[PDB]
Design a protein around this nucleic acid. Structure first.
Lengths: 291, 199, 130, 190, 106, 171
RNA sequence: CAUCGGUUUGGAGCGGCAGGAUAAUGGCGGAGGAAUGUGGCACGGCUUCUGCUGUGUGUUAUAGCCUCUGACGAUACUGCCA
RNA sequence: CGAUGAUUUUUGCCCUGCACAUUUUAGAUGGAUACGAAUAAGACUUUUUAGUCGCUGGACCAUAGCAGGCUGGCAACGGUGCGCUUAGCGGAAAGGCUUUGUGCGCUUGCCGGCGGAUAGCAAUGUCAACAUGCGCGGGGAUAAAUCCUUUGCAUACGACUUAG
């Protein structure tokens, strides 16, 4: 028999499985599409969520009842010290998708990013990138050869940059290293830009302007194992129900003689990877500004 | 009819099911087959008809868990692979070995770009279909249902054909020089005797 | 001018020389249908055959009337000397060379290899200086 | 029935040079050149002389024979397109709201911009096909002239303009507003 | 001298079988280059060897042979029926056999 | 089928009342003489008060073609049964033997009318001597002067499964 | 491996004989006829008449065909060979 | 499935030239012998008029020598194998395709001299590429992870983010 009354489904089937993210660092699934006519520029930046605040703002929206009138709005502060460029990756177009061809690194990597490559840094000889650092010996033609290979074959160029987490109040000493795609200009222009920025800091004001709409990639707040009532927003059963009420009463019809993937079940809630779009930039603050 | 170490088939202009049946019998009988340019394969019937058929195929999925159901592959090589695998007892060890004897590709990747590709006349569209009938190119059917790398393959196929044309121009030049050398040694004692033997 | 590229087909017409069984020559004397013709020749039996069972050759026996009997076909075939015209083409020559190769013995194949070695020596010598 | 043979004869005027190779027709005349691919049809061509071309279908069934005079007509339209041109005239039909039609140029492209159609605030834009010329007639009030060498392109631009001005949610027997093709002729009058 | 072969290449294709029941006592063999029963009748009575390798050495050799003979043709495309002293194991479907030129009648 | 034309002659069994009954002849297109004599009795009981039990077969003879290598046009008059009724029709065929036109007829009514051998009566087979006797356009188109036609798109049969050269269809 | 005996599957198998409309054809000869009319002839459109060609005429000419037939000679098909 | 960092001061690890012995084989036994495109079309020559090619690979290359031995001569200055060596191209899975010079062989292009037996009238009558191990020889480099304590951006326990 049909439902006696209609109701929408509880929750979205487009965010399955409701499992923990594989990594805590949110990964850019898709980068902005590259336009050659634009200047060479980064397409992403890494920051740390500091907290939320409140602002007051005059609204400029003609036809609104709040037009030219003050609004009080919630805002989020993202601590973003400049990122350091340490590498560059070339990607090749193949009938099976993008494939990384070569990764070229900078000569000197700071300790905070070399800790990224260790589970037990304090017990180590800290040998990472020492032979590679020797590859720069007095002519650095190996590095130039790899860069020429990237220029010759790569269609997508991404830089390798890490956060300067020592400038944040966090007690963690590992930097966060991510690939940020370079858009604009030819492939040769991108490779030259990446090389000239090795061991240099890149600030947010070179990536984001004020009034921009930007997207946020992050792993949400973890809540652990959760029942269906709060995981999926299902209706609580009556007070007098035997064996409890924070359940889904019917988890399936007799046929299919299986539990369907579309039924709400208890499981891990939160700590999901999300891509959230259209967040307006109210302020790109400067660390040196005392106001 | 010779037993070959590998038979590399140029899949351009071949009807999907006829090539699939021939390749199935070939790999069951212990012959290694490579099919290249699966994006240039053909199915009889107009494009819309075959697209409707593929959408009928897409309808089919396990109700209680979509991850268990049929896995609808969109690449042209995988469409040919599904056609072939339907003609193989793939759930036995012998069918599994026979399927290990087979490789299917879009384009002509290495090392087969410098090898000999043959055709299969019993499965060629220009030789099988009545000259007025409509047909589909599997490359267009694949793009219409989700295959993402059509334009990548054609960019790489144009690069391969430019290189393959340089090969042929060089090979043609050395054939012309060798023919001029064989003309000089004609009407010689060895050449006259070889003409009486049929050579 | 217009410069229209025209087809160079072989036509089903009275006077076409055809191969039958890939061995023997015959000529079309009258058309039955799209699929069938009546063929005749000096060394073949006058018969109704399907065009799928025969191959049209590039040779036409000129001025052969439709429905000609065996005597007329034989006389005009001898006059036009169709056998010599056929035997002078690369098609008939390749057929003859295939037959001749198929009649070789093991000793003759050995001799073919030896003579090929000699001719290849001469050919490479000529090729390296030209 | 499989008709044994069916033929059609092109007629080539004095200044025109048809040129066919592998079912790719290239017609050249005083007014320019037009090309057409006919690879979707099984036809053969024979040049009878410089003024006639034979178009033949061998052993063709009813539909494949039907596709023969259409080949003839398409090549004839190409021939008359490079020696006389094509001209479609469109009349602006409105009861109350005048239709404001302009030939604008945005992004380096020519467009026909229809405004105020039935009083709507919407601005209709129709891309002008390559090789097609639009003009607002001076000799006639509320007339648009669509001209060009290719009949197909000219008629398709005229159809685009006519179709974009369709009336919705009204009795179109009563609301007869629109832009309609009134005359289909040639640039060079005959 | 690059070639030393004195046998015709063959393949073990199948057993004699209906749709569901197989007969291991008869093997179906594809002789290379044979495409008609007229071609295959040259090979009737010829001896067939299946040569394979085994773990244990017998008299210093790890190569063992199962011998057979061609008995009759099969079908219309030049396959033959063979009869081996010990039935060919089913794992050899698609494996190559050797069609010997003896007993010779040339 | 693969047919022959037979002359079958039969009569009623003589009685003391009628000691020389009339001899009746039929032209039968049958694969063999067993079906030729069977078809004869089938049509006589459609026309005369006779049976195989009360009759007698007098002669069965093959009628060979008079000019088996002369191309003719035949008109065949038919009476066939469809799924709904019984119909008369007339059709024309080009062939060198009278038997081969009847064989084409049986294939043709099988193909165009789903008419089986059992559903067909051959009323008459006539060789059309004059070109004006030809009524049907599908055989009249082969009686034009200086008839030529090519055979475009030739498909060549290969002995091997794989071919090392590009396919062609010239001819 | 050879030879034998029993059973059996074949060969591009070969030869002899018989029957039929004592095959029908075909080839040769004779007689008659016509057209999807060859040459010729008479008008034409493009050809320095470059298989030029079209339409008329008529009956073998600078091609042939159809029908009837006379004396031979084969083959197909179906059987038989102890 | 890819890129990249570091890879044990242990007698352990990596690369490499051999030498020997082993395990395995979905099945070596001259060569997987490379345009593209059309098919009511392709390719030659004159002329764009015309003629010619195909009508299958029963092709092409390779193929003679104790599974191919030992020696001599003639003719050519070619062919081929291996080793160094020069330069270029190839990123779709390039890991291959060319190329320079040089050295050592062989050469059946032609003509010679010697050898093979007895495995007995057949018995696969054993001749291959991949892998691993073990002895030598030459070079080369000199780590981490887990448990544990800690954290709380995590968490039923595992797991995760941190720090040591």
């Amino acid at each position: 028999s049909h439902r006696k009354y209609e109701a929408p489904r509880h929750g979205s089937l487009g965010f399955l499985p409701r499992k923990r993210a594989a990594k805590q660092r949110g990964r850019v699934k898709s980068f902005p599409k590259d336009v050659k006519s634009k200047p060479v520029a980064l397409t992403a930046f890494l920051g740390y969520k500091a907290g939320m605040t409140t602002i007051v703002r005059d609204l400029d929206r003609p036809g609104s009842k709040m037009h030219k009138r003050e609004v009080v709005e919630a805002a989020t502060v993202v601590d973003t010290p400049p990122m350091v460029v340490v590498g560059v990756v070339g990607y090749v177009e193949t009938p099976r998708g993008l494939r990384s061809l070569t990764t070229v690194w900078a000569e000197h990597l700071s300790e905070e990013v070399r800790r990224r490559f260790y589970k037990n840094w304090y017990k180590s000889k800290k040998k990472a990138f020492t032979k590679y650092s020797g590859k720069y010996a007095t002519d650095a033609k190996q590095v130039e050869t790899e860069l020429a290979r990237i220029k010759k074959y790569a269609s997508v160029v991404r830089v390798l940059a890490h956060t300067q987490i020592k400038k944040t109040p966090l007690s963690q000493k590992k930097a966060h290293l991510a690939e940020i795609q370079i858009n604009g200009g030819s492939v040769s222009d991108k490779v030259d830009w990446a090389k000239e920025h090795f061991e240099k800091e890149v600030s947010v004001d070179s990536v984001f302007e004020q009034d921009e709409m930007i997207d946020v990639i992050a792993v949400t707040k973890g809540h652990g194992f959760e029942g269906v009532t709060h995981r999926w927003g299902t209706k609580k059963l009556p007070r007098k129900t035997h064996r409890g009420l924070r359940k889904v009463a019917c988890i399936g019809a007799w046929h299919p003689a299986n539990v369907n993937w579309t039924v709400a079940r208890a499981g891990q809630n939160g700590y999901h990877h999300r891509t959230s779009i259209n967040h307006k930039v109210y302020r790109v603050g400067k660390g040196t500004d005392e106001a | 009819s010779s037993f070959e170490k590998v038979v590399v088939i140029d899949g351009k202009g071949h009807l999907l099911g006829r090539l699939a049946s021939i390749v199935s019998k070939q790999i069951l009988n212990g012959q290694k087959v490579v099919v290249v340019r699966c994006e240039e394969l053909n199915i009889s019937g107009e494009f819309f008809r075959n697209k409707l058929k593929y959408h009928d195929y897409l309808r089919k999925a396990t109700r209680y868990n979509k991850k268990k159901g049929p896995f609808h592959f969109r690449a042209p090589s995988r469409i040919l692979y599904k056609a072939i695998r339907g003609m193989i007892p793939h759930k036995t060890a012998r069918g599994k070995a026979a399927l290990e004897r087979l490789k299917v590709f879009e384009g002509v990747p290495p090392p087969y770009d410098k090898k000999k590709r043959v055709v299969v006349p019993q499965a060629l569209r220009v030789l099988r279909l009545k000259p007025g009938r409509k047909y589909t190119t599997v490359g267009k059917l694949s793009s219409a249902v989700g295959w993402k790398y059509e334009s990548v393959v054609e960019k790489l196929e144009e690069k391969r054909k430019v290189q393959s044309a340089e090969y042929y121009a060089k090979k043609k030049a050395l054939t012309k020089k060798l023919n001029a050398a064989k003309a000089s040694t004609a009407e010689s004692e060895a050449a006259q005797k070889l003409a009486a033997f049929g050579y | 001018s217009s410069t229209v590229k025209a087809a160079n087909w072989r036509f089903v017409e009275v006077g076409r020389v055809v191969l039958v069984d890939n061995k023997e020559l015959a000529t079309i004397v009258e058309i039955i249908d799209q699929k069938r013709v009546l063929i005749d020749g000096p060394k073949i039996q006058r018969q109704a055959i399907a065009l799928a069972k025969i191959v049209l050759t590039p040779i036409v026996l000129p001025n052969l009337p439709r429905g000609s009997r065996t005597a007329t076909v034989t006389k005009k075939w001898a006059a036009a000397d169709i056998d010599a015209k056929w035997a002078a083409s690369g098609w008939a020559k390749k057929l003859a060379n295939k037959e001749r190769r198929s009649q070789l013995s093991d000793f003759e194949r050995f001799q073919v290899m030896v003579l090929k070695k000699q001719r290849r020596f001469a050919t490479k010598k000529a090729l390296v200086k030209a | 029935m499989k008709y044994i043979q069916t033929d059609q004869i092109l007629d080539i005027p004095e200044g025109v040079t048809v040129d066919i190779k592998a079912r790719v027709v290239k017609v050249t005349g005083p007014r320019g050149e037009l090309t057409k691919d006919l690879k979707h049809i099984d036809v053969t061509f024979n040049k009878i002389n410089n003024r006639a071309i034979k178009i033949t279908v061998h052993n063709g069934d009813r539909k494949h024979v039907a596709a023969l005079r259409t080949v003839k007509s398409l090549i004839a339209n190409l021939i008359t397109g490079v020696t006389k041109g094509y001209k479609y005239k469109m009349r602006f039909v409105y009861a109350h709201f005048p239709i404001n039609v302009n030939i604008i140029k945005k992004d380096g492209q020519d467009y026909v911009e229809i405004r105020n159609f039935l009083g709507e605030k919407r601005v209709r834009e129709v891309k002008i096909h390559e090789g097609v010329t639009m003009e607002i007639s001076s000799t006639q009030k509320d007339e648009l002239i669509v001209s060009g060498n290719s009949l197909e392109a000219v008629s398709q631009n005229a159809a685009d303009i006519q179709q974009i001005c369709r009336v919705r949610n009204k009795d179109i027997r009563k609301f007869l507003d629109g832009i309609y093709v009134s005359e289909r002729g040639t640039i060079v009058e005959e | 001298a690059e070639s030393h072969r004195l046998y015709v290449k063959g393949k073990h294709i199948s057993y004699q079988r209906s749709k569901s029941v197989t007969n291991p006592n008869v093997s179906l063999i594809q002789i290379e280059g044979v495409a008609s029963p007229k071609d295959a009748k040259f090979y009737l009575g010829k001896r067939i060897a299946y040569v394979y390798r085994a773990p244990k050495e017998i008299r210093g050799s790890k190569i063992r042979v199962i011998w057979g003979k061609v008995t009759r043709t099969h079908g219309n495309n030049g396959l033959v029926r063979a009869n081996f002293k010990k039935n060919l194991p089913p794992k050899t479907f698609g494996a190559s056999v050797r069609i010997m030129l003896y007993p010779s009648n040339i | 089928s693969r047919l022959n034309e037979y002359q079958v002659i039969g009569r009623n069994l003589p009685t003391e009342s009628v000691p020389e009954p009339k001899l009746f002849r039929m032209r039968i297109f049958a694969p063999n003489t067993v079906v030729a004599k069977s078809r004869y009795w089938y049509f006589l009981q459609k026309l005369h008060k006779v049976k195989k039990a009360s009759g007698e077969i007098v002669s069965v003879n093959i009628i060979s073609e008079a000019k088996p290598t002369k191309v003719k046009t035949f008109g065949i008059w038919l009476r066939y049964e469809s799924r709904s009724g019984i119909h008369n029709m007339y059709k024309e065929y080009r062939d060198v033997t009278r038997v081969g036109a009847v064989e084409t007829m049986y294939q043709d009514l099988a193909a165009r009318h789903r008419a089986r051998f059992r559903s067909i009566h051959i009323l008459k087979v006539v060789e059309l001597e004059k070109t004006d006797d030809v009524k049907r356009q599908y055989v009249k188109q082969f009686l034009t002067k200086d008839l030529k036609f090519p055979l475009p798109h030739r498909v060549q049969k290969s002995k091997k499964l794989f071919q090392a050269t590009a396919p062609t269809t010239f001819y």
